[PDB]
């Protein structure tokens, strides 16, 4: 895969070897195929289809490597893992993997070794996925969602509590298959395989009420730290919920071309359109550090950052943007 990266880079988390913030896509080079890219506050990891995990950036909380004397992984380097990796997620200063044996491991947050998180899971080969943001992780298998970490806004369960070290069952649909969990810094939205919202919890952004948003099928839900975005491909719209102090509400001016992909970082969004074949990638929201393009004033609207001959995959981090071809 060909990977481009830009935005915040004070800890060399863009994998470019230098520590300068960048405002246009830069080729970042670890023939491995990228499964996905996950981002924490100041570290980045790339998982390839072969099961290898590579990372770069801050290691002062044990995000990437067991050597306490290693403060930062300056360039892309393999992450030592207990077994081949099938899925990965990051939190603020943490990295969590699902391995090929179906075991879940966490490092970071001051812990320098991968430690097993004992999630109740079946050994029947039902897909096991992990999602993470800020100080929470969830693990999904079948109809069940387990989670751990902060609970100060009742995102995992009620009543509030500072932190839950051991996994708790957040939701069991008792029926429909869960597709994924979209996570904000202190809230989450559970989506089924039909694109319907089945549950939501925590400090939900202003204007979003679970019971008013469970009607429509075929949605895609994305979350920034403090906002929810609902992409409706049938109508070619993105509906946003949040305060929008820094242009995070998706711009409502009519798009002339179909949206074929959406991703979010901490406080920005990344949009891909098909202009048929040519694909355009745009950013909206908070872009002080260059993660939305060269216009860094967080002005509203979609800012074009790249054009590609094939359909890209996009990923967002903490004021970082990733484009994978």
């Amino acid at each position: 895969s060909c990977v481009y990266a830009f935005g915040s880079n004070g800890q060399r988390q863009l994998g470019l070897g230098h520590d300068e913030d960048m405002d246009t896509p830069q080729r970042s080079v670890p023939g491995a195929i990228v499964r996905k890219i996950a981002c924490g506050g100041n570290h980045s990891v790339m998982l390839t289809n072969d099961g290898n995990l590579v990372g770069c950036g801050d290691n002062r909380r044990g995000e990437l490597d067991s050597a306490q004397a290693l403060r930062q992984v300056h360039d892309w380097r393999p992450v030592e893992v207990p077994a081949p990796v099938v899925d990965v997620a990051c939190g603020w200063d943490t990295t969590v993997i699902v391995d090929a044996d179906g075991r879940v491991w966490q490092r970071g947050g001051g812990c320098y070794e991968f430690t097993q998180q004992h999630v109740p899971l079946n050994s029947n080969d039902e897909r096991i996925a992990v999602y993470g943001c800020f100080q929470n992780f969830v693990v999904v298998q079948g109809t069940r969602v387990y989670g751990w970490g902060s609970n100060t806004k009742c995102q995992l369960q009620e009543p509030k509590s500072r932190s839950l070290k051991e996994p708790v069952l957040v939701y069991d649909t008792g029926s429909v298959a869960v597709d994924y969990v979209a996570m904000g810094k202190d809230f989450m939205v559970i989506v089924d395989e039909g694109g319907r919202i089945v549950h939501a919890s925590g400090r939900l952004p202003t204007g979003f009420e679970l019971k008013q948003q469970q009607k429509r099928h075929n949605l895609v839900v994305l979350c920034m730290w403090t906002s929810i975005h609902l992409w409706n491909a049938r109508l070619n719209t993105v509906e946003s919920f949040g305060r929008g102090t820094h242009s995070q509400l998706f711009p409502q001016e009519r798009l002339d071309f179909p949206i074929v992909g959406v991703a979010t970082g901490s406080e920005h969004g990344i949009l891909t359109t098909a202009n048929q074949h040519c694909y355009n990638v745009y950013c909206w929201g908070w872009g002080e550090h260059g993660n939305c393009g060269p216009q860094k004033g967080s002005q509203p609207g979609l800012q074009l950052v790249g054009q590609y001959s094939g359909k890209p995959r996009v990923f967002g981090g903490c004021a970082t943007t990733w484009i994978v071809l």
Binding site: S8, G10, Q11, Q13, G41, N42, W92, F134, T152, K185, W225, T226, R243, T245, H246, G265, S266, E267, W286, E288, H289, C318, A319
Partner: protein, 60 residues
């Protein structure tokens, strides 16, 4: 107005520097000094970006 509001009980106390901190979406941390908070300061600032947060306390 401000980027967000954060509950004082959700911030992390750093006893070395005697300040409360909280992650910022830029990768750094918002900060409010203990002495400033004691005296009535209700805004935390980020050393790496222009975002600011209001610090609050809710009984609910």
């Amino acid at each position: 107005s401000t980027y967000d509001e954060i509950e004082i009980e959700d911030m992390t106390f750093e006893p070395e520097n005697q300040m409360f901190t909280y992650p910022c979406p830029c990768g750094d941390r918002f900060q409010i000094y203990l002495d400033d908070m004691f005296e009535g300061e209700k805004v935390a600032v980020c050393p790496s970006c222009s975002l600011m947060i209001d610090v609050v306390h809710h009984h609910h």
